Every structure is written in structure tokens, then in C-alpha cells.
Design a protein around this ligand. Structure first.
Ligand SMILES: *C(=O)/C=C\N[C@@H](C(=O)O)[C@](C)(Cn1ccnn1)[SH](=O)=O
Length: 269
């Protein structure tokens, strides 16, 4: 019946919708097109920050990276502000997560794998985490621009949640480093209208959004019940019918998250 609720969202928003919530002790897994591929968009910036965190000591976050206005080829609200003084690796992670800064993400890719191998290196951190399905093939902004049906720069709701689960609720990062990722996602500025909107205020939410062409809108989150019970939420969508310039629908994601919140919070004693 929840599948039918999701189907209606799709009909109404003229859109394809992907949802995954892993099973916990107390709940079943929520799945709707969980193994269909969806463009990553900026959602990759979360596991990217984990990858830089993991490969280096915390000292590495103080490394000043300089770049130029030449390097800014995508929306970079923080990297623009710091073009002349440079940004540190920590600042970059800050911007990548909290502002979805494209330049910031492209520098972390270079830090991770050098020039020319950052995508390979990021995909390999996911492989190290037992995700064989996901893949990153390009930098910003081109990763946001592949056609529907192209496997390049795709993940699936299933895969990316299971990765986020490991990153936030598992040991893929130690506590000093995991906390920093969580603090950055917790302080996200781009996600108020997606998973966050679908959940009561006394549930805690950390998240990383995505947005892109063909009406792509993503959100991945980790949510906490008022009594600290955690869940992973992956919600992904596109709207290929409108062409490359089609309107993405944040409302579609908030509705989905509301269905999920509905399930996870109603207690049936
Ligand atoms: C961020 O999560 C993923 C994509 N961001 C896009 C967006 O914010 O809509 C762009 C990178 C925006 N853009 C236009 C020109 N340069 N950047 S994507 O639409 O290209």
C-alpha cells in the first residue's frame, strides 16, 4: 500500500522516485526502486569527506589549498568567497557538505586521488566499503549532467544508504573523525525542504542533498527518534519528461520523507 502511495507521488510530480530505509531491529526495510540507478549529484560529497578523513590524520584538515578563479566552473558560494586567500582541507569539507560547493568537492577529489584520478579514488573508497554498484566518473558540474539511463555518476537508494549507515552509524570512521562528518551534515543549509520537512521537529536530522539536470533532486539523511533510535533515509528523484532543464521537486522529497516518518513513528502497541 506504501508502494501505491509512492506510485501516486510519481504520477503527480511526473517523476521517478527512489526510496530506501534499511530494516532496524524493530522495523522492516522500506524499498521503492531501491536498486534502480539515480544520479548521485552532490550526495557523493558525504562519502567523499569520509574518504579524505579516513586516508589522513586530522592534522591534514589544516592544509591550505590554493586555487584560482579558473577552477570555479560550478556553483561555489564558499569557494568564491575564499578564492584569493585559499581554503584549508577542513574548510573545503565544511563547504562541500554544508553548501554543496562544487569547487570544494573538486579540490577534495584532487586531494584524494591527484589530478585526473579523483573519481577513480572516490569510487574506490566506496569499493573499500563493500559497495560494488555505485560509481563516480566526472567532476562538477558535468557529473550533474549525464542523460537518464547512463550509468555514469549513478548510485542507487539502496547502495548510498548502506554507505551512509557505515559512515554515520558504523565503524568506517573512528569517533573523532565520524563526529566531524556528522557535525557538518547536522549543520547543512541546503536541506530544510527535503527529508527535514517530512519529519517532526523532535526527530534529529543530518543530511546531504543533491540537485541536477532532468529535474534531479536527492536527499540522503540519518534521522534520530526523540529517544535516540536511528534510521537511514535515502530519497532520490528525477523528471526526464521535462528535458535537461526540467524543474526538480523538493516537495516530492518532503512528501516521501513524510510517508517514511509516518511508518517509523507510529507505534501500534
Ligand atoms: C549539488 O548537489 C549538485 C549539483 N548542483 C547543481 C545545482 O545546484 O543545481 C549545479 C552544479 C548548478 N550549476 C549550474 C552551473 N554551474 N553549477 S548543476 O545544475 O550544474
Amino acid at each position: 500500500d506504501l508502494a501505491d502511495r509512492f506510485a501516486e507521488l510519481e504520477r503527480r510530480y511526473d517523476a521517478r522516485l527512489g526510496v530506501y530505509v534499511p530494516a532496524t531491529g524493530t522495523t522492516a526495510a522500506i524499498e521503492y526502486r531501491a536498486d534502480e540507478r539515480f544520479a548521485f549529484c552532490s550526495t557523493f560529497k558525504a562519502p567523499l569527506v569520509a574518504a579524505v578523513l579516513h586516508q589522513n590524520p586530522l592534522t591534514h584538515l589544516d592544509k591550505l589549498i590554493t586555487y584560482t578563479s579558473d577552477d570555479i566552473r560550478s556553483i561555489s558560494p564558499v569557494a568564491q568567497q575564499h578564492v584569493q586567500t585559499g581554503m584549508t582541507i577542513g574548510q573545503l569539507c565544511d563547504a562541500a557538505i554544508r553548501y554543496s560547493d562544487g569547487t570544494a568537492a573538486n579540490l577534495l577529489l584532487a586531494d584524494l586521488g591527484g589530478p585526473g584520478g579523483g573519481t577513480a579514488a572516490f569510487t574506490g573508497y566506496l569499493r573499500s566499503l563493500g559497495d560494488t554498484v555505485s560509481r563516480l566518473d566526472a567532476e562538477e558540474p558535468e557529473l550533474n549532467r549525464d542523460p537518464p539511463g547512463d550509468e555514469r555518476d549513478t548510485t542507487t537508494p539502496h547502495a548510498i544508504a548502506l554507505v551512509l549507515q557505515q559512515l554515520v552509524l558504523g565503524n568506517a570512521l573512528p569517533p573523532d573523525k565520524r563526529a566531524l562528518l556528522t557535525d557538518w551534515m547536522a549543520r547543512n543549509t541546503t536541506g530544510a525542504k527535503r527529508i527535514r520537512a517530512g519529519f517532526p521537529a523532535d526527530w534529529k536530522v543530518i543530511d546531504k542533498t543533491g540537485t541536477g539536470d532532468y529535474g534531479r533532486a536527492n536527499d540522503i539523511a540519518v534521522v534520530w527518534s526523540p529517544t535516540g533510535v536511528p534510521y537511514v533515509v535515502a530519497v532520490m528523484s528525477d523528471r526526464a519528461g521535462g528535458g535537461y532543464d526540467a524543474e526538480p521537486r523538493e516537495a516530492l522529497l518532503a512528501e516521501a520523507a513524510t510517508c517514511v516518518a509516518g511508518v517509523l513513528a507510529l507505534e501500534h502497541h
